[PDB]
Amino acid sequence: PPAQLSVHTVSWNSGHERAPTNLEELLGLNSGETPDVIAVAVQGFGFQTDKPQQGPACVKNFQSLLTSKGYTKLKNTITETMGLTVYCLEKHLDQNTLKNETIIVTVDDQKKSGGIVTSFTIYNKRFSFTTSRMSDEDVTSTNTKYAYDTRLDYSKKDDPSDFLFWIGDLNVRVETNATHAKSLVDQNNIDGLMAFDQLKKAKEQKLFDGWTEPQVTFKPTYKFKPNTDEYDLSATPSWTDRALYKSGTGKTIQPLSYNSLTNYKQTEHRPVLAKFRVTL
Numbered sequence: 001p002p003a004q005l006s007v008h009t010v011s012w013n014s015g016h017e018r019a020p021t022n023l024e025e026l027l028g029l030n031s032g033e034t035p036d037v038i039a040v041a042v043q044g045f046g047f048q049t050d051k052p053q054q055g056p057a058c059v060k061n062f063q064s065l066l067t068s069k070g071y072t073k074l075k076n077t078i079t080e081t082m083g084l085t086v087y088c089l090e091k092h093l094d095q096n097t098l099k100n101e102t103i104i105v106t107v108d109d110q111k112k113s114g115g116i117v118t119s120f121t122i123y124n125k126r127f128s129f130t131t132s133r134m135s136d137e138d139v140t141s142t143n144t145k146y147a148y149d150t151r152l153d154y155s156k157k158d159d160p161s162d163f164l165f166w167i168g169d170l171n172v173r174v175e176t177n178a179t180h181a182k183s184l185v186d187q188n189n190i191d192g193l194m195a196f197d198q199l200k201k202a203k204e205q206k207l208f209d210g211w212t213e214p215q216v217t218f219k220p221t222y223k224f225k226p227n228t229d230e231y232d233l234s235a236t237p238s239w240t241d242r243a244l245y246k247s248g249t250g251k252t253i254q255p256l257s258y259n260s261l262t263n264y265k266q267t268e269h270r271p272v273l274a275k276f277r278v279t280l
């Protein structure tokens, strides 16, 4: 059983947009890396019903690229507003010990907000992947708009997972006006603008407790005029898709990279790719 493993995560608030064509870039495979685990999270509208009938393409295209690479799909879970998919190199799996499990948490009577958690064990180490979705107007267990619920947090289990990732649009925004935010973006003062981001506020309120975000060096990933690099300044530019990590058991999780994928411009938000190396 190996000393270390690699994990790629991508999330995208993709809205009504269909999965793209070039998936290699999306999953961070385009420079020949072969991560041990890949998780893909989306937030948007109408995945479950699938009225555009786009389900069949995703499967076809994702399964085509990933199977030839040695990946097994551990689980795809979709709701009306969220999607989470977890892949693992076939070579790591032992059916007797994997304990592959997913819960869905739902906070409203329309089941539009909440989250999804997918967990599995390899080499007697337990991974958990969460995505979540909250609306600004929602009444909530935290009485905030942030997409946290303690049920989705497997570091607050009696037996906390070894490696935990939370990916998606956490409904955390930049709390200042658009003029000032756009000035900071133009100056490339990413840390200056992050000073106004709400993740720290969420944490002062004991949400995402002990969860770390890798250092952010990219400009806000929202809100863009589609197919441009131009901010739509009807909203204050913000970091919407995020990746957070923790360990419940003192295991080292080292971010290698954390980047928006500005090549994917087809919508208002840009997908975010994180790569980690975890020590078992």
Ligand code: HEM
Binding pocket: 012, 014, 015, 016, 017, 018, 019, 020, 040, 042, 044, 045, 046, 047, 048, 049, 050, 051, 052, 053, 054, 055, 056, 058, 059, 060, 062, 063, 073, 076, 078, 083, 085
């Ligand atoms: C960038 C946007 C999207 C991404 C990245 C994405 C990603 C994924 C992934 C990774 C899977 C699992 C593929 C596999 O089987 O290995 C999946 C499945 C699926 N997607 Fe999406 N998706 C997107 C948009 C949508 C949209 C707009 C819809 C329709 C409302 C949709 C409907 C579905 C359905 C129905 C499945 C599962 C179908 C089945 O299991 O038979 N997706 N998607």
